Design a protein around this ligand. Sequence first.
Ligand SMILES: *C(=N)[C@H]1CN(c2ccc(C(F)(F)F)nc2)C(=O)N1c1cncc2ccccc12
Ligand SMILES: *C(=N)[C@H]1CN(c2ccc(C(F)(F)F)nc2)C(=O)N1c1cncc2ccccc12
Lengths: 306, 306
Amino acid sequence: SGFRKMAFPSGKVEGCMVQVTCGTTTLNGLWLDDVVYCPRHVICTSEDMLNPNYEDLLIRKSNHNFLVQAGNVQLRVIGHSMQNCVLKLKVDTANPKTPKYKFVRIQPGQTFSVLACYNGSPSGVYQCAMRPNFTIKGSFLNGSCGSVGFNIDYDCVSFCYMHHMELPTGVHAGTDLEGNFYGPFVDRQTAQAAGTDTTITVNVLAWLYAAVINGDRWFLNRFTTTLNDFNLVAMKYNYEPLTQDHVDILGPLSAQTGIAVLDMCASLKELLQNGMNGRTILGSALLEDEFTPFDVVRQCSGVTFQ
Amino acid sequence: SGFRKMAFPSGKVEGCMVQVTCGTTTLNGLWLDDVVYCPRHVICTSEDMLNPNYEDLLIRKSNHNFLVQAGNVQLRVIGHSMQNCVLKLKVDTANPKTPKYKFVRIQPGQTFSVLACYNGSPSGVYQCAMRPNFTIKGSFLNGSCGSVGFNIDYDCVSFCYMHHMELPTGVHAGTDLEGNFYGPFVDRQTAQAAGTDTTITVNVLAWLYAAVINGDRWFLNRFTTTLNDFNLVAMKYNYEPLTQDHVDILGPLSAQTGIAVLDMCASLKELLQNGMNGRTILGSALLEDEFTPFDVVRQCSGVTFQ
Ligand SMILES: *C(=N)[C@H]1CN(c2ccc(C(F)(F)F)nc2)C(=O)N1c1cncc2ccccc12
Ligand SMILES: *C(=N)[C@H]1CN(c2ccc(C(F)(F)F)nc2)C(=O)N1c1cncc2ccccc12
């Protein structure tokens, strides 16, 4: 019993975190085989940041302007190159602790674990969701750039996020591990609007199933709805539309609980329209949308990893 | 910016988790040097559990009734003994991955990371608090017994909890690593009442400071209070009394925010009496008490570990 915001075990990622310094700027890098990945804005000065020409700035850099450290170990940079917004520092020694890994680009609404780091050392781990507007609501201080987000599938770490920036609005933005930003954001110090953020509807349904599995079910009603009628109510409340793919993904939780997906949708419809009347669900007074159906199934059935 | 429920990096603990089987019962053990620790109820049958005589049951067990596994590796048990409620299985090989470690008994109101495991394999990591009534609100399925809770101090893992049981009430109970239960609980299948649970007042104040540091401060008022007057209000709402030691612990957050501790206490007093009027604090519609002052300072200043 019980339901918690749960991150993946971080051990396989911990052994990959190093420190990257360029001038006065220190941030984190990801050391896999003989390559260190980090945000390319590490090469900017405080004057460069307002409108950097990264091609020009990188040409001005030498290998020895990049100070990479793993623990007590200095890693010698053999070469530097740029893939989109990510710097690749080839080093002369492959990380002996390199796990089996993939680089993946995740979908808005999907979740991942962040290993927040400073000076190449792990500070803590927590679960995030990629918001529909391609931001994340992280916990990041100065020096946290280069921290990565990841999932674990069997024995393979799927790296999906590298932290680049905090926007003037306090929210967080970054790239996949090929250096492509999630969302419309650019790595320059300028005002950048994120989109209207919406609530991840399929995730809220998943969490309501989690509540039911844990005996918390006061919100259930005796109604059903059509996908079309539910959606007409959900857009009024800034909830993402629900698709048939979403209904199909919730199938396993429907079967475990004996509650049809469209019946749970009818329950959510009434919660949106009436509120919670001062009650709580799974210890929360608000509807939670940062758990995917898979997260719920993994937590309520005990999926483990090598 | 941002504030999240953050666990310690789990890598040093991951390398210590093994599987312990006795008969049909499989659970998790903690392998440090040449000793495997696990709950002593692993030796019970389904009939033994209602009123086990653990001394008698253990005498009936042979070394070969304990099947210990670390990955593909079978660990040969050289000896078995009982320290309070914890079984100690001496094995013939010391864990090469044994980190520097301590065993500690934590205080109600203090927090720790749980590495939830099944079949000796890590499933996920999440932060808990030791409730004032010595339970924890975990996420634990069958087979999760033997999962441990821990803190990290510099380069040393301080093990503080081992999971033993889910009570008929859905909440979770366990021991320190010397096998002494937290709280009044016993390892037999009988109805056991936990105490009235109370809210950890110093933790709520810490989280209000966290909100202020993150720009979330609508709840501040222009009042102060005495420790005595605050406490008279707090007991009405099932909040633990606040001591001078608690005020002293909050000093650093008071200095960072420019808000005196007794001024924050005056703000909490009014939140308890008036509610939140449909607002939120750090993305929560309820007052949160599972962050210690140290947790806030570590997260808002970036404490890291070896
Ligand atoms: C991460 N280490 C810092 C740096 N940073 C940043 C640097 C350069 C640029 C630009 F525009 F591309 F040149 N943009 C951003 C940034 O945003 N950082 C960061 C990240 N997360 C949180 C914080 C909190 C406080 C200060 C900086 C943060
Ligand atoms: C943990 N593996 C299980 C087993 N267990 C338990 C076994 C024996 C005894 C007794 F009384 F000492 F003999 N008491 C308890 C227990 O409580 N487990 C457990 C722990 N956390 C969560 C769950 C969820 C579902 C089923 C069992 C759980």
